Design a binder for this molecule. Sequence first.
Ligand code: NAP
Ligand code: NAP
Lengths: 243, 243
Amino acid sequence: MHYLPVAIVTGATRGIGKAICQKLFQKGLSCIILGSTKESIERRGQLQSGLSYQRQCAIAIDFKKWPHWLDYESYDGIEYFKDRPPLKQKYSTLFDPCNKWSNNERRYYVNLLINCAGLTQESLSVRTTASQIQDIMNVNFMSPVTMTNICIKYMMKSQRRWPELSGQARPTIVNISSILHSGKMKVPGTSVYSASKAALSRFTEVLAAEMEPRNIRCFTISPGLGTSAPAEIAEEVWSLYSR
Amino acid sequence: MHYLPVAIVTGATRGIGKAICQKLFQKGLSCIILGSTKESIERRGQLQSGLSYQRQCAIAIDFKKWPHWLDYESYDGIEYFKDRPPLKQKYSTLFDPCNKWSNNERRYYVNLLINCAGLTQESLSVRTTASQIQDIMNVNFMSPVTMTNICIKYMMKSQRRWPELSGQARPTIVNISSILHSGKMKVPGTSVYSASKAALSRFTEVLAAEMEPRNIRCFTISPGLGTSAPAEIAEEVWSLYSR
Ligand SMILES: NC(=O)c1ccc[n+]([C@@H]2O[C@H](COP(=O)([O-])OP(=O)(O)OC[C@H]3O[C@@H](n4cnc5c(N)ncnc54)[C@H](OP(=O)(O)O)[C@@H]3O)[C@@H](O)[C@H]2O)c1
Ligand SMILES: NC(=O)c1ccc[n+]([C@@H]2O[C@H](COP(=O)([O-])OP(=O)(O)OC[C@H]3O[C@@H](n4cnc5c(N)ncnc54)[C@H](OP(=O)(O)O)[C@@H]3O)[C@@H](O)[C@H]2O)c1
């Protein structure tokens, strides 16, 4: 029996999340990509350059609709292939792609979660409405907290269901913050955005202490706007996961 | 015409908020105390020791019900007096006590907001449900953000309505964070609580940059569980406001 690790990467349609996905794919991981909408995830040489057992799909979840998205009966998604066109389909859960990909000889399992989704603010605090604050916090913080908790539960359940997974990299959560989370860079129009990323960073730090005796790794990375290359962050992610 | 400054203090029924209220009252400010419920705000020598024009009331707002509480038609409150029993009554807004207290010769106006309300977590992240995350964030972060924004708007409007208020301490926001917001103290069962306070702190720092050219002061203070005396924090608050 072959165990094939999978990464879930939120905000993977562009920016840092996309770069992380590209890195994980080159390193042989199967990937579950998240974007905000059907249209967004609809968006060849990458797939061709991949290994035979390697799989990739994308799932649309609008994180603004937290906590309601937790309760959806199914999610819209698209599967990608080496030598055939993309297939639009429904997934019952986040982890359903793993069940579809698996058979008697190959067990696909989520071993890595990357929270990279982000919604910018671009309004002065006093101009920011309740629904806008709600949107920013739902995407940046509440949704990744939920993502983290459901993935950890799944990761714990997976080790019980598949004893040989003790022989593998440890289950890992990486949360991507922002340079705007702390320090001297205080940009007008980013008060709640900066707060949301400070929350995500701190949550992960405390979560790491709860998770250490459970052998689950929890890391946070704070990229620049000074500035950081998506490719460099992706390398840092891989380094932390493979260390 | 006499202008009498008022402080709004959330989480003023106990702990640090209560200590801050006691300090502000001894310093001659009128106070609007917030607690979570009717029963809570219902809870003599303090009032007697106060000045003749000095007023105090308490208002119940359950911050868990964010953003719905913004839309309530009225709020339950209680007014306190030197030489008569407490009077239960309805307030149409946060700033309605100021309108009730004011007359032709005395203008009560809010000049200071202290966000001190806090809801603890006491559950491991993986055991924390969506509704519990929502409760923690609503009380600790979303509600104080809304409080800050509505008070700033009121403060700006007040200076337009009462030109002589240019002659007074500048309008001030103080947000009380926690030592659990950053650094080495990472307590299991506090992941979202710690995150919420990190958010509040960062929000205030960025807000301060937006507010500097508007001559509105925004401060944050991070008390200990190592540890800090409520009285010392109250002194720090007064020091920042009167500096
Ligand atoms: N005003 C600010 O707050 C601000 C200002 C200046 C600079 N910056 C710095 O530079 C950063 C760049 O941000 P960016 O927009 O370019 O981010 P990005 O990382 O390039 O893209 C955001 C990702 O998050 C996902 N996402 C957005 N909304 C979502 C939703 N409702 N549900 C699920 N996923 C969602 C996106 O998916 P889709 O593709 O589906 O949308 C996308 O993959 C800023 O965020 C900040 O670090 C921030
Ligand atoms: N698990 C944790 O998260 C944790 C653990 C250990 C230590 N600590 C450290 O020590 C601190 C002590 O906290 P505490 O409970 O003693 O806080 P507190 O400051 O003594 O009291 C909380 C204040 O917030 C108000 N508040 C609570 N819920 C509210 C709601 N829904 N709406 C409006 N206002 C509300 C309260 O009003 P009412 O009186 O109406 O309730 C009260 O005035 C901790 O919070 C933390 O800094 C935290």
